[PDB]
Amino acid sequence: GVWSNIHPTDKVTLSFANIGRPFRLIYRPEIFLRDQQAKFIQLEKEHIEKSKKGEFVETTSPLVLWN
Amino acid sequence: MFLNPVKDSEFDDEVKGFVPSEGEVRFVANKNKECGYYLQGIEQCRRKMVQLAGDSSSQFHSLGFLPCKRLVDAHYRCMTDDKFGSTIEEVPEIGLDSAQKFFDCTFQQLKPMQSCRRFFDQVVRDVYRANGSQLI
Amino acid sequence: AFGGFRQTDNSLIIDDRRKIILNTRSLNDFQQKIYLRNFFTNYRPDLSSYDYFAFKEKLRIGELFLNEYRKRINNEVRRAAILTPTSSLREKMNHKIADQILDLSSPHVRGAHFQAVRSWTDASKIVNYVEEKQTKINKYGLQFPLLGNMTEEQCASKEDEVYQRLLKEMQKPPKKA
Amino acid sequence: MFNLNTIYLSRIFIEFNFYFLFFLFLISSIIFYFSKIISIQNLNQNSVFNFLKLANIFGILISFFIHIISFWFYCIYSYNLSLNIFSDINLYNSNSIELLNNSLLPNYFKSNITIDFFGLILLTLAYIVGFVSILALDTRLYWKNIKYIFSFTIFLLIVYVYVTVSNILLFFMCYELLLIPSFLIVYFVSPSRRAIQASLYFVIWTQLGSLLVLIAISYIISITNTYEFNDLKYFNFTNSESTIIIFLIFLGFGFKAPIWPFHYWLTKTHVEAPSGFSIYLSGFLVKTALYGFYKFNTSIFIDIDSSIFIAICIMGVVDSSLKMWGQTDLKKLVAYGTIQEMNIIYLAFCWGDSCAILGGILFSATHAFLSALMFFLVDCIYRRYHTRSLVEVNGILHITPNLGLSILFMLVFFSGIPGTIKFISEFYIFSGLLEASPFICFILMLVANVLGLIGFSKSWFNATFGMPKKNTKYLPMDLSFKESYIILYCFFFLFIFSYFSSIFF
Amino acid sequence: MSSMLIWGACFGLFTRAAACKASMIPLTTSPWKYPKYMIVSAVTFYYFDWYRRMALEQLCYNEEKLERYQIRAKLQSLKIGEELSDAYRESFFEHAVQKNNI
Amino acid sequence: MSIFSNIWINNDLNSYGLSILLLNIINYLIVFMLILSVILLTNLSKFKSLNQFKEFNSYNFILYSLIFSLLSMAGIPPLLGFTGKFLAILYSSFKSQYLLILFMTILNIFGMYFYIQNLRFVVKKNKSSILNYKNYYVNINYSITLNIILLNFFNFFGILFLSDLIIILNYISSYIYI
Amino acid sequence: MNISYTGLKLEDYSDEVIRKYKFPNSNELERFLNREQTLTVQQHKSAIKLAQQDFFAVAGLLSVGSLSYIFYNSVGGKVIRDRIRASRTKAQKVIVLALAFVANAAALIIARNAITAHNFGWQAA
Amino acid sequence: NYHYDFCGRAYMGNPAVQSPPKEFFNYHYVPDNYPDALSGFRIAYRDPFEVQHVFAYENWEYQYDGQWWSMGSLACNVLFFCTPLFLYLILQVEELNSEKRGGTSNKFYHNNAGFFHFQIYDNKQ
Numbered sequence A: 001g002v003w004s005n006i007h008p009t010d011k012v013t014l015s016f017a018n019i020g021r022p023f024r025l026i027y028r029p030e031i032f033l034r035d036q037q038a039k040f041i042q043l044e045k046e047h048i049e050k051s052k053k054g055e056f057v058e059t060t061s062p063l064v065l066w067n
Numbered sequence B: 001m002f003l004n005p006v007k008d009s010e011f012d013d014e015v016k017g018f019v020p021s022e023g024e025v026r027f028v029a030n031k032n033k034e035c036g037y038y039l040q041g042i043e044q045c046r047r048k049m050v051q052l053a054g055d056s057s058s059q060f061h062s063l064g065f066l067p068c069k070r071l072v073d074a075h076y077r078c079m080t081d082d083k084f085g086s087t088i089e090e091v092p093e094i095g096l097d098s099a100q101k102f103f104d105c106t107f108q109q110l111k112p113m114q115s116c117r118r119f120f121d122q123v124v125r126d127v128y129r130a131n132g133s134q135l136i
Numbered sequence C: 001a002f003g004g005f006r007q008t009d010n011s012l013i014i015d016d017r018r019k020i021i022l023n024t025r026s027l028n029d030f031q032q033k034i035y036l037r038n039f040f041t042n043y044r045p046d047l048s049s050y051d052y053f054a055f056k057e058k059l060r061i062g063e064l065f066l067n068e069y070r071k072r073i074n075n076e077v078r079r080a081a082i083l084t085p086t087s088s089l090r091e092k093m094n095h096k097i098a099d100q101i102l103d104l105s106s107p108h109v110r111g112a113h114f115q116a117v118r119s120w121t122d123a124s125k126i127v128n129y130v131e132e133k134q135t136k137i138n139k140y141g142l143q144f145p146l147l148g149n150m151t152e153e154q155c156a157s158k159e160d161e162v163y164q165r166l167l168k169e170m171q172k173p174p175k176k177a
Numbered sequence D: 001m002f003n004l005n006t007i008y009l010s011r012i013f014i015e016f017n018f019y020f021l022f023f024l025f026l027i028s029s030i031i032f033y034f035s036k037i038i039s040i041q042n043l044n045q046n047s048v049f050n051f052l053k054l055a056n057i058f059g060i061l062i063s064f065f066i067h068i069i070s071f072w073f074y075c076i077y078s079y080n081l082s083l084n085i086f087s088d089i090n091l092y093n094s095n096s097i098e099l100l101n102n103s104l105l106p107n108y109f110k111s112n113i114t115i116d117f118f119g120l121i122l123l124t125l126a127y128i129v130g131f132v133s134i135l136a137l138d139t140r141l142y143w144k145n146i147k148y149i150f151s152f153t154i155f156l157l158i159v160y161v162y163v164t165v166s167n168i169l170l171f172f173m174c175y176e177l178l179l180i181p182s183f184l185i186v187y188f189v190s191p192s193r194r195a196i197q198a199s200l201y202f203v204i205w206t207q208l209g210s211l212l213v214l215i216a217i218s219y220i221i222s223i224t225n226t227y228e229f230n231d232l233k234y235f236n237f238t239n240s241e242s243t244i245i246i247f248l249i250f251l252g253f254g255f256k257a258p259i260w261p262f263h264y265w266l267t268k269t270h271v272e273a274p275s276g277f278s279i280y281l282s283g284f285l286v287k288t289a290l291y292g293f294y295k296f297n298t299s300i301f302i303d304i305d306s307s308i309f310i311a312i313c314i315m316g317v318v319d320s321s322l323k324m325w326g327q328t329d330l331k332k333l334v335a336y337g338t339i340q341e342m343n344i345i346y347l348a349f350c351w352g353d354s355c356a357i358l359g360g361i362l363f364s365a366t367h368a369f370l371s372a373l374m375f376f377l378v379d380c381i382y383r384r385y386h387t388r389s390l391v392e393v394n395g396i397l398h399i400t401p402n403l404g405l406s407i408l409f410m411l412v413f414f415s416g417i418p419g420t421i422k423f424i425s426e427f428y429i430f431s432g433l434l435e436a437s438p439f440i441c442f443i444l445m446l447v448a449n450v451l452g453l454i455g456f457s458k459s460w461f462n463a464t465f466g467m468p469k470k471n472t473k474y475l476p477m478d479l480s481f482k483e484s485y486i487i488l489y490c491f492f493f494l495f496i497f498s499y500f501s502s503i504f505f
Numbered sequence E: 001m002s003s004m005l006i007w008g009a010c011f012g013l014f015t016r017a018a019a020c021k022a023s024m025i026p027l028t029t030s031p032w033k034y035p036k037y038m039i040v041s042a043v044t045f046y047y048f049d050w051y052r053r054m055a056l057e058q059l060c061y062n063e064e065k066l067e068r069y070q071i072r073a074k075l076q077s078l079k080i081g082e083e084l085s086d087a088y089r090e091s092f093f094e095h096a097v098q099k100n101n102i
Numbered sequence F: 001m002s003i004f005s006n007i008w009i010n011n012d013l014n015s016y017g018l019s020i021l022l023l024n025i026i027n028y029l030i031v032f033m034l035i036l037s038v039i040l041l042t043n044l045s046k047f048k049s050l051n052q053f054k055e056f057n058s059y060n061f062i063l064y065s066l067i068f069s070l071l072s073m074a075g076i077p078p079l080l081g082f083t084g085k086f087l088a089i090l091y092s093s094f095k096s097q098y099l100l101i102l103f104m105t106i107l108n109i110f111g112m113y114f115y116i117q118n119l120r121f122v123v124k125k126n127k128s129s130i131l132n133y134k135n136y137y138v139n140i141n142y143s144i145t146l147n148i149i150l151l152n153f154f155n156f157f158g159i160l161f162l163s164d165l166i167i168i169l170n171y172i173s174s175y176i177y178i
Numbered sequence G: 001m002n003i004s005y006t007g008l009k010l011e012d013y014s015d016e017v018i019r020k021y022k023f024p025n026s027n028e029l030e031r032f033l034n035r036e037q038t039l040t041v042q043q044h045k046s047a048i049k050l051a052q053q054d055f056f057a058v059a060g061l062l063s064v065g066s067l068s069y070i071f072y073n074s075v076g077g078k079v080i081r082d083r084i085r086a087s088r089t090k091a092q093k094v095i096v097l098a099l100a101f102v103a104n105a106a107a108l109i110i111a112r113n114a115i116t117a118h119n120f121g122w123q124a125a
Numbered sequence H: 001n002y003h004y005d006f007c008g009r010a011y012m013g014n015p016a017v018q019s020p021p022k023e024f025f026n027y028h029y030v031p032d033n034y035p036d037a038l039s040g041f042r043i044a045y046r047d048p049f050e051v052q053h054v055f056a057y058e059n060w061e062y063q064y065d066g067q068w069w070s071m072g073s074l075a076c077n078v079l080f081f082c083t084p085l086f087l088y089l090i091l092q093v094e095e096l097n098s099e100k101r102g103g104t105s106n107k108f109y110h111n112n113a114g115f116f117h118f119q120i121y122d123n124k125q
């Protein structure tokens, strides 16, 4: 309930299991991943624009991010 | 799975099992471990597209699952090591049938990814069996 | 996120695929994951989690099935001993029955040993044999109450399918030779 | 024909039995605390101690009945789940059924309950052995230790969370929680004066292994940030990490589950502990360690030879069996028997997740019941004859025929006669060990079932037989109904549990 | 359950009862201290909830800055000669040229 | 620290060891405060030797408060000191210091027995009289008893609320740019 | 996020590609969205309600039976209990004998019902 | 053959009659212990020799360093000491046999990919 309402995981597990990991990763992992992928997002956008255009870029092809 | 039908069978349906080569098993395991991100992405994007344009009256109802095309192509390239084409549509004829089965599993029947990964791995295994030394 | 443990060895690692050279002690978490820790720890690493759970269950059932073969042949030997007098008993046993008894020995069936030492190929073969038996049973749908669960509509559809299959098989002509 | 109704009934029963126990404990504690200014017994017929005893006893009993029902539901559920997974072979079809939680009670510690056959066997052992021990400690609880009437309810709650959780950290915490109540019981409830030192020895010896297991858990958690107990499938430990983890886990859990040479604390505690608490200790508190070792070693992939661990277990078995002869103290002799059986059980877990686990589980159950029986017999002997030494005790049969008969049948059951789960477990373990290493199996069987058996039987036969000519004015009468029915129930379980479904064994 | 105020009130009630039991005085002694303890506990625990949530938010914000320190600290921690190596040369130039935008 | 096309990824929080050290210091201070409050509630002149631990053999509140405080100092799992010791070992494992873990464990077990042995002396033949007399009656301080009760509650249930304290300590330490 | 319908035109993609990535029937889409392909959320809720009711009934019956048996058969020694039951009225004796048995039997029957799946529609032949 | 006069190093009680011990270890109870009062609470006076035997072994201790090797028989003591190594070496030889044949070896088998015995594996909506 209230004391654990901050996080779905239990308080004891939060206190002990998570050692050294960023609280940004523990809470709100999506924002952490998006910040990590910031440049990859623009690379993927440029790759999509070029693919719509005639050019096809193979260097950035693996960058297909969904989170 | 891993069962071959008996060509000369007294009854309608008979199957004899076979064990894939160690090289094939290693290749499939490594590629699954490396490209597991794309399969989860396919699942999540499928659910997202169904939620967004599931309703018939939705504006994007005519573009269903097209965004998942990039994920599917990326997964195919990752599994095949960027060889044998840069798109799923470029799959060889040996694995074309398995690719069609996978698409029916995923998008038409909307069956679990547990089920559809079987067909995707079947496509990969067919390509590997066809080539052998080309993938390793 | 997965992490790693600092390494102490001073060996050099060569990754021909990425065309780089690393040192074991200098590896970070991701590099350790990529180079070390990659080894397989199951018979069929290629299969997914659900697929390998099914594979494990089928392997266990196949081991039990081979043990059941051994138990059945032992029971048949007991039946032969009781029915037939000692005279001609060995003469009749020196047939399919004795060969099967020897062929179902410990290396082929794990009677009471803690572990059946099987290669991954052997496990795959056993699972394939179990799947062949399952397919043969499911052709006629004998697994509704045992070795299966289905709803009423599923049962009715399976009954219709099995009826059609039996009709087609009966209409088929005898196999030549 | 399996339907979702059975699945949800099983899950609901498992989840709600814990809350039943918790609410009973909470209400009893509230009454105890708020009925009196000072939480001690009022030496009169209208004391709250009677109500607390009633509540504890018939909360444990009712929860045990509900646990029987829930265990049967789990057996059906697991069998049908395996059938559902195995039966279907069509590639398109896959068993993906998702269950939605109830809206009545919350998930304790925000953890989804997962139940296994070994865990439920451990929980059933907890229930039964706790019932026996609480029935035993009535004469010990008096006027300042009545607060320990809830100790077995606390044990039940801890074990329930321990066995119905899929979290590594919660698992370890539940395993570690057991120390405080047991130490308090030994410290404040043991009549003998040597119990003061026995408690310290118990604490230190068990805490060394607890620290070892803590180091192993820290290695697992720091390297793998996961806690779900199943994400370890996707992470592989290097050879060095795996060997360190297995060594630490084995030594730490063997500190609790007595192994050679770490059984000095066990002998001291059994000798100097309450006769009612020794039953619970030997029966259950040494098997949580076995369960934890099984879970961890089956979760982790280990690429090391288990010859060293097997040798340690066999050495412990041989040591206990040889020392059995020289013990004139019945309680210490039973403690050595417990050491032997626990070492055999631990050896049964030295082959990873092989078929030896089934024999280990069955032997754990039979050892729990047999040790409960033996310690209860020792308790009766000590309580009616004011001594538990062979030199001072002789000719029990001729003055208390029922007690002598119980001793003789206990010896017969300990011998491992066919028709008993003891014999079944011995058969499993020895059948596996014969193919694993036949000469080692022969040595183990010879020692344990001849030399140790003879040493064990010598003292019990000498006590049962003879002629009690000494202190004729002070001789006791016989067993009471409570003791007689406890012995009969132990025998009945040891005999009839062999008919349990063979699917799980 | 969900109301920190109610949780604090219950905590204060039980604290008062436990204090009475420990002091061996009747639980009805100083009745006015029950509502006092309940109110004080409710208020303090409500404030502590708000403060823990604020501290978590501010820590999440500070971790963003701490990441910038880690990236630059890692580059400065490189052993002599590794700053121009193929594995760090591009990042070092990025942090020494592109970010030299003062 | 991982590099992927000049993109740095950091899955480690550097300002965590300092938080763990602060947590250990705070936990030790809390337990020391509990034991010293128990002592101050009673008469000070009685306690002058390890044998005098029997003098704590007084009514249940004092007796069990001392017992649980000693166990917490020793590091018994459910109590508060275990949180600090376990988190220290966890951080040592995270930093990959097996020898440091070994020496920490040796010191921990030796100190554990050092604390535990006093429970043997706590046993007393009778009930002690360690309370100061005021107005012809023993003086029991309600305020100190209440403080000891709060400390006992936190010592018992620190594991439940430790996540909030860890969050606060990490928040405080994050301001340090190390 | 670049995974969106924005910028997508059916002209760019081939007819076969569109047919492959075409939405399935509306019923299939609804089933997939609601996760009711095999079982309905209402079926799950009904099963949960039945499970909770069965657990409550079983636990209450077990408690009532156990307590009644204890209080009826825990009055004293054999002679005292026999004399008390002899002085006991007819209806009181009937309830004393029947209450515990009926409660325990009802609990056990309710437990057996769940494992016994008699209400299956395939019963025929 | 064992006689007290000629035993020398295989110690045992002397046959000669001895006076009862004046002082010996005795049963002691925790302070404020609740007496055990089963069967009328009748306690008999304990025999000094019997009590001495009861409490002798617990208090027995070695007088000097290294006495353990010499006491009893050196050969049997050394064999008992070396027993764990004998067991380990026998296990290793049996494992040599297992390796060269193909039977069960002493290793932690991992057939199940972390799947516990008959564990309930489920997901929630």
Ligand SMILES: CCCCCCCCCCCCCCCCCC(=O)OC[C@H](COP(=O)([O-])OCC(O)COP(=O)([O-])OC[C@@H](COC(=O)CCCCCCCCCCCCCCCCC)OC(=O)CCCCCCCCCCCCCCCCC)OC(=O)CCCCCCCCCCCCCCCCC
Binding pocket: E005, E006, E009, E031, E032, E033, E035, E036, E038, E039, E042
């Ligand atoms: C959504 C929320 C969900 C979560 C829940 C959150 C809420 C949690 C809390 C829940 C409870 C709510 C309580 C609200 C009021 C709180 C007020 C307050 O500040 O409290 C602390 C404060 C007490 O602290 P303190 O005295 O300042 O502390 C001194 C130190 O100890 C130092 O000690 P000392 O030794 O130095 O001195 C001892 C003390 C000795 O003195 C005392 O004994 C203290 C005073 C006690 C008696 C007070 C008078 C009572 C009668 C009149 C009350 C006012 C009218 C109420 C109108 C209600 C109409 C509906 O000395 C003094 O006299 C010093 C204080 C001077 C007097 C202070 C007067 C304050 C009056 C406050 C009135 C509150 C109600 C107002 C409501 C207005 C409505 C319009 O006030 C009280 O607690 C007053 C007593 C109230 C409880 C009485 C209990 C015994 C009688 C029970 C009778 C029950 C009958 C009905 C039965 C029904 C069931 C069958």
Ligand SMILES: CCCCCCCCCCCCCCCCCC(=O)OC[C@H](COP(=O)([O-])OCC(O)COP(=O)([O-])OC[C@@H](COC(=O)CCCCCCCCCCCCCCCCC)OC(=O)CCCCCCCCCCCCCCCCC)OC(=O)CCCCCCCCCCCCCCCCC
Binding pocket: A012, D022, D025, D026, D029, D030, D033, D039, D106, D107, D108, D109, D147, D154, D157, D158, D161, D162, D170, D173, D174, D177, D180, E011, E014, E015, E017, E018, E019, E021, E022, F060, F061, F064, F065, F078, F148, F149, F150, F152, F153, F156, F157, F159, F160
């Ligand atoms: C008047 C008070 C009435 C209270 C009613 C209950 C309400 C809750 C308590 C609130 C009290 C607030 C004020 C503090 C008073 C206590 C301190 C004191 O000095 O008082 C002196 C005051 C007067 O002094 P005295 O009585 O003369 O001196 C006696 C000494 O205190 C010696 O006494 P003692 O030996 O009896 O003391 C207890 C003894 C031993 O105490 C115990 O062993 C406690 C056993 C509790 C039963 C449940 C345990 C279940 C375990 C499952 C496994 C979980 C694993 C999780 C992973 C992490 C590891 C935990 O010491 C410990 O507690 C140390 C071991 C701690 C183990 C940690 C267990 C954590 C479990 C968390 C709750 C789980 C709930 C799940 C279900 C809900 C799901 C949504 O003492 C009393 O009146 C008696 C106090 C005894 C303890 C009361 C609490 C026991 C019942 C707890 C039920 C609720 C669960 C716990 C969570 C509570 C919220 C955080």
Ligand SMILES: CCCCCCCCCCCCCCCCCC(=O)OC[C@H](COP(=O)([O-])OCC(O)COP(=O)([O-])OC[C@@H](COC(=O)CCCCCCCCCCCCCCCCC)OC(=O)CCCCCCCCCCCCCCCCC)OC(=O)CCCCCCCCCCCCCCCCC
Binding pocket: E012, E015, E016, E033, E036, E037, E040, E041, E044, E048, F030, F033, F143, F146, F150, F151, F154, F157, F158, F159, F161, F162, F164, F165
């Ligand atoms: C997981 C591990 C966790 C470890 C925890 C370690 C600590 C545990 C034990 C200590 C905790 C603090 C307990 C309260 C203070 C003691 C005095 C007291 O209030 O009782 C006497 C007083 C007794 O009254 P009485 O019996 O009617 O009459 C007494 C005398 O007759 C007449 O009395 P008087 O006239 O002489 O004096 C009355 C005055 C006496 O009060 C005092 O003088 C208080 C003395 C303590 C001062 C230090 C408090 C610091 C609080 C912050 C957190 C750190 C705590 C550190 C504690 C240990 C340090 C050595 O009473 C008050 O006003 C009490 C107010 C207490 C709340 C103070 C809040 C200050 C916050 C300041 C920082 C704010 C954040 C800034 C952020 C900056 C960002 C830029 O108690 C009450 O009135 C209520 C008693 C029952 C409810 C107590 C509720 C306590 C809640 C504690 C929450 C702790 C934090 C949240 C949990 C954290 C972990 C998850």
Ligand SMILES: CCCCCCCCCCCCCCCCCC(=O)OC[C@H](COP(=O)([O-])OCC(O)COP(=O)([O-])OC[C@@H](COC(=O)CCCCCCCCCCCCCCCCC)OC(=O)CCCCCCCCCCCCCCCCC)OC(=O)CCCCCCCCCCCCCCCCC
Binding pocket: H010, H072, H073, H074, H075, H076, H086
């Ligand atoms: C490494 C290669 C191995 C393979 C090659 C073949 C085997 C060679 C083994 C070595 C044989 C020759 C050396 C043995 C000398 C005696 C032992 C010794 O030193 O201890 C001090 C010896 C024993 O003193 P104590 O035991 O402290 O005092 C007892 C009093 O007698 C009072 O006693 P009590 O009247 O109360 O009666 C107790 C008596 C009776 O005790 C009993 O009835 C209880 C059971 C005792 C154990 C009986 C042996 C069972 C089978 C052993 C299997 C071991 C397997 C594990 C080791 C494998 C290593 C390969 O206890 C004794 O057994 C004591 C006598 C000495 C031990 C004899 C048995 C063990 C010897 C070692 C055998 C090793 C075999 C290895 C091959 C295994 C097969 C693969 O002290 C004396 O010198 C006093 C005289 C004692 C009688 C001596 C009998 C004549 C022995 C031959 C002498 C000439 C040796 C020339 C050596 C040449 C240079 C290399």
Ligand SMILES: CCCCCCCCCCCCCCCCCC(=O)OC[C@H](COP(=O)([O-])OCC[N+](C)(C)C)OC(=O)CCCCCCCCCCCCCCCCC
Binding pocket: D020, D023, D024, D027, D028, D054, D055, D056, D058, D059, G063, G064, G065, G067, G068, G071, G072
């Ligand atoms: C917000 C809601 C909070 C709910 C709090 C619950 C309050 C509980 C109060 C308990 C009071 C106990 C004493 C009652 C008076 C007894 C009078 C008496 O002896 O006369 C005989 C009468 C009737 O006796 P009888 O001779 O008719 O025997 C038949 C007994 N029954 C009716 C139960 C079938 O009362 C009883 O027998 C009641 C016995 C009560 C004690 C039971 C102890 C066993 C454990 C359960 C205790 C309660 C905990 C909660 C339930 C368990 C967990 C789910």
Ligand SMILES: CCCCCCCCCCCCCCCCCC(=O)OC[C@H](COP(=O)([O-])OCC[N+](C)(C)C)OC(=O)CCCCCCCCCCCCCCCCC
Binding pocket: C008, C009, D212, D215, D239, D240, D243, D244, D247, D248, D251, F098, F099, F101, F102, F105, F106
């Ligand atoms: C039995 C002793 C008395 C009872 C108390 C118990 C204390 C000992 C508990 C067991 C500790 C582990 C021992 C076995 C280790 C096996 C692995 C190994 O070291 O092989 C070299 C291993 C395995 O090497 P490898 O050759 O197999 O493979 C890796 C090889 N390289 C690195 C070259 C690629 O090598 C290492 O990486 C070195 C690790 C050394 C770790 C030693 C310290 C451990 C500290 C944590 C535990 C401390 C517990 C203390 C408890 C309190 C004591 C009072």
Ligand SMILES: CCCCCCCCCCCCCCCCCC(=O)OC[C@H](COP(=O)([O-])OCC[N+](C)(C)C)OC(=O)CCCCCCCCCCCCCCCCC
Binding pocket: D034, D035, D036, D037, E025, E026, E027, E028, E034
């Ligand atoms: C619009 C607002 C209107 C508000 C109106 C005012 C409401 C006032 C309510 C007062 C309730 C008092 C209940 C007393 C119960 C006593 C029970 C009993 O006898 O037990 C004795 C027992 C026994 O005490 P004892 O120690 O004397 O024991 C006697 C027994 N022998 C002889 C064996 C020793 O102790 C107690 O339980 C009494 C002390 C605890 C009292 C707790 C009171 C809590 C009150 C909470 C009020 C919450 C209000 C929230 C309002 C929110 C508004 C938004």
Ligand SMILES: CCCCCCCCCCCCCCCC(=O)OC[C@H](COP(=O)(O)O)OC(=O)CCCCCCCCCCCCCCC
Binding pocket: D019, D020, D023, D024, D104, D105, D106, E001, G055, G056, G059, G060, G063, G064, G067
């Ligand atoms: C002994 C009867 C047992 C009946 C079987 C179900 C027992 C469930 C657990 C009950 C525990 C004690 C009450 C707790 C109250 C509380 O604080 O309960 C508080 C919580 C409130 O939960 P939330 O606040 O999260 O909503 O109660 C619940 O969650 C549900 C309580 C139980 C509901 C069923 C009640 C059945 C009544 C049967 C009456 C006849 C009994 C006859 C006995 C002889």
Ligand SMILES: Nc1ncnc2c1ncn2[C@@H]1O[C@H](COP(=O)(O)OP(=O)(O)O)[C@@H](O)[C@H]1O
Binding pocket: H013, H014, H015, H016
């Ligand atoms: N505890 C003992 N230790 C050694 N010898 C004993 C012991 N008890 C009896 N004996 C032996 O028993 C014999 C004496 O028998 P006993 O019953 O005492 O009759 P009595 O003393 O009248 O001869 C002696 O040989 C003596 O050595």
